[PDB]
Structure 1
Amino acid sequence: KSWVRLKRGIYKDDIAQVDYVEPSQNTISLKMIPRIDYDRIKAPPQRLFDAEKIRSLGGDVASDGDFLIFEGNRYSRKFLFKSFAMSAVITEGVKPTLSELEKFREHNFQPGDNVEVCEGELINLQGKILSVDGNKITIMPKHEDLKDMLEFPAQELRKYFKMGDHVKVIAGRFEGDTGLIVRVEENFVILFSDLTMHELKVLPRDLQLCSETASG
């Protein structure tokens, strides 16, 4: 019940849900979204399989209720269900998204943002971000009243922001909205938007320091 992406054909690198793994180690059944024009243009983006349209247009089509065979022995039901070779798919490194789930940790530090230190001997030192790396950043923050550049990894830092500053939301339900924060609690950071005056409570990690005007 994993996800793969086909190698050859018109379905190249398209998300396919592995329905049934055939134990013969030759092919597996894959659930796909058809990239077809329903035999109307050819004598294409992904859209839902319309069985009524392919029954109306005719051609190579066989109907079994919701099961269907069409246009080069393509097997569909209710959604394609066709066998494809294991060597003709990539079974390692797909990682589909939430939109593909409907069809079928993380670190984000930016230069100029303000962060504090939550643990260690250098605790409660707020500094501005200079550079960024992948997992162990070894950041060089410009702290208050310190001309030297220290070193901090990602697990030690946290996106701390003083009350009354430009704030944006990076991801989640509140993304795209800006405003000002009011009171900084332990982790619940409440803010008011530039558009509306509704209370928006966010995690400290879901905040960034950007001085651009909101779009609206």
Structure 2
Amino acid sequence: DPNLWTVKCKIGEERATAISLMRKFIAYQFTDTPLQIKSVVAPEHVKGYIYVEAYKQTHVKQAIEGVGNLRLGYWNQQMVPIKEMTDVLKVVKKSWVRLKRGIYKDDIAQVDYVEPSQNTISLKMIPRIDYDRIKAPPQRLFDAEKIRSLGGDVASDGDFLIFEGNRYSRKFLFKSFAMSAVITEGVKPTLSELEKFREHNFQPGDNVEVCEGELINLQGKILSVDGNKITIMPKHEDLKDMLEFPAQELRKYFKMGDHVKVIAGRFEGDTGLIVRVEENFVILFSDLTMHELKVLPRDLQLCSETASGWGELVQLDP
């Protein structure tokens, strides 16, 4: 069978190189200078170089002759080894999207109206503009009074507005954008973006118990961490051998009167000491204040650093 050979190409012009080589093959397939290569591969995400299928390197060199885009691979070519030719063709994979091009790149966009025409969708955006004041920018709320005052390309219809390259806004940009110019898969915005428009956290050194199974009620110190099925290596009390536990079987148990910090929630950022551990309500006193803070066992971590809890002289007025 023939073999694939790597040829360096102009970046961003690999598909065009494949099309040009196909046209070159078809043009000269009946002449006295045939292209003895078999196929040309320009993958979708592989940028910078293409692959040529042939039994010889000399065939590749004589086939790419006259192609300027491949001149940087003309003198020398590198073969794809045999075991790895199956990986060249291997391919993998009121909502929110993120624009690909323009000044609004990778900015959260609430899909306001989806057009069944399958060309563009209406998107709600926060404008990253200077209101035609600096140009002759961070996200901020759309100010229609400012763009009315400064003038320029501005058309006002009460709350609705057209401006600066047919950008459409209402009360917040509301503009149509190409569906292929946005990403619909893997945005997952945050609570702050909701306002604008399970989880496992184990760390080394923390103390965890066992809530179920034949190894129940064994408290040990965390060594390693992984994603979902941790297969943890906990240093238990009076046990020199290291056992295995997933994330689901464990729980962030802590003995009474030890350093505790809050990872997330309303009580995040506060350090202190737990007084009594109930089944799940763990009550603690902060290092700053002596108020009762009740937390879940999972929202507790073992860190020994002192609390932060600054105090500068500033001029309110002269």
Q: How much does 1:113 deviate?
A: 0.1
Cα deviations by residue, 1:123-156 (Å, 9 ceiling, x for unpaired): 0000000000000000000000000000000000
Pair 1:161-2:254 in alignment: yes
The CA deviation at 1:51 is 0.1
Distance 1:179 1:172 in 2: 15
More strand by share: 1
Give distance in 1, aligned partners of 2:185 and 2:200: 24
- The whole-number CA distance in structure 1 between the counterparts of 2:259 and 2:184 is 44
Mapped partners of 2:240, 2:231: distance in 1: 17
| Cα offset, 1:14, TM superposition | 0.2
Match of 2:190 among 97, 109, 118: 97
Shift of 1:73: 0.2
Q: 1-side partners of 2:115 and 2:166: how far apart?
A: 19
Could you tell me how far apart the structure 1 residues matched to 2:106 and 2:121 are? 16
Which residue does the alignment assign to 2:242?
149
User: Helix, strand or coil: the match of 2:121?
Assistant: strand
Task: Please state whether the residue corresponding to 2:180 is helix, strand or coil.
Answer: coil
1:57 is aligned to: 150
The secondary structure found in structure 2 opposite 1:87 is helix
For 2:276 and 2:183, the matched residues in 1 are separated by 49
Greater RCO between the two (CA within 8 Å, min separation 6)? 1
Q: Which deviations, in whole Å up to 9, do the C-alpha atoms of 1:43-100 show, x marking residues without a partner? A: 0000000000000000000000000000000000000000001100001110000000
Deviation of 1:203 after TM superposition, in Å, equals: 0.2
Q: How far apart, in 2, do the equivalents of 1:173 and 1:70 lie?
A: 42
TM-score by length of 1: 0.99
More helix by share: 2
RMSD: 0.2
* CA-to-aligned-CA distance 1:18-49 (integer Å, 9 cap, x gap): 00000000000000000000000000000000
Question: Shift of the alpha carbon at 1:199?
Answer: 0.1
**Which whole-Å deviations, capped at 9, do the CAs of 1:137-184 have from their partners, x for residues lacking one?**
000000000000000000000000000000000000000000000000
CA shift, 1:212, in A, is 0.1
Distance 1:31 1:88 in 2: 15
Indicate the SS of the match to 1:23. coil
What is the aligned counterpart of 2:219 among 115, 119, 126? 126
Identity %: 100
Match of 1:190 in 2: 283
Task: Extract unaligned runs of 5+ from structure 2.
Answer: 1-93, 309-318
How far 1:12 moved relative to its partner? 0.1
Alpha-carbon shift at residue 188 of structure 1 (Å): 0.1
Query: What CA distance in whole angstroms lies between the structure 2 residues aligned with 1:91 and 1:197?
Result: 48
Alignment gaps of 5+ in structure 1: none
Q: CA deviation at 1:119?
A: 0.1
**How many residues are matched?**
215
Q: CA deviation at 1:9?
A: 0.1
Distance between the aligned counterparts of 2:219 and 2:270, measured in 1? Answer: 25
- Tell me the SS of whatever aligns to 2:280: coil
C-alpha distance in structure 2 between counterparts of 1:93 and 1:85, whole Å = 18
Q: What is the SS of the residue equivalent to 1:17?
A: strand
Are positions 1:47 and 2:140 aligned together?
Answer: yes
SS of corresponding position for 2:261: strand
The 1-side partners of 2:264 and 2:163 are apart by 42
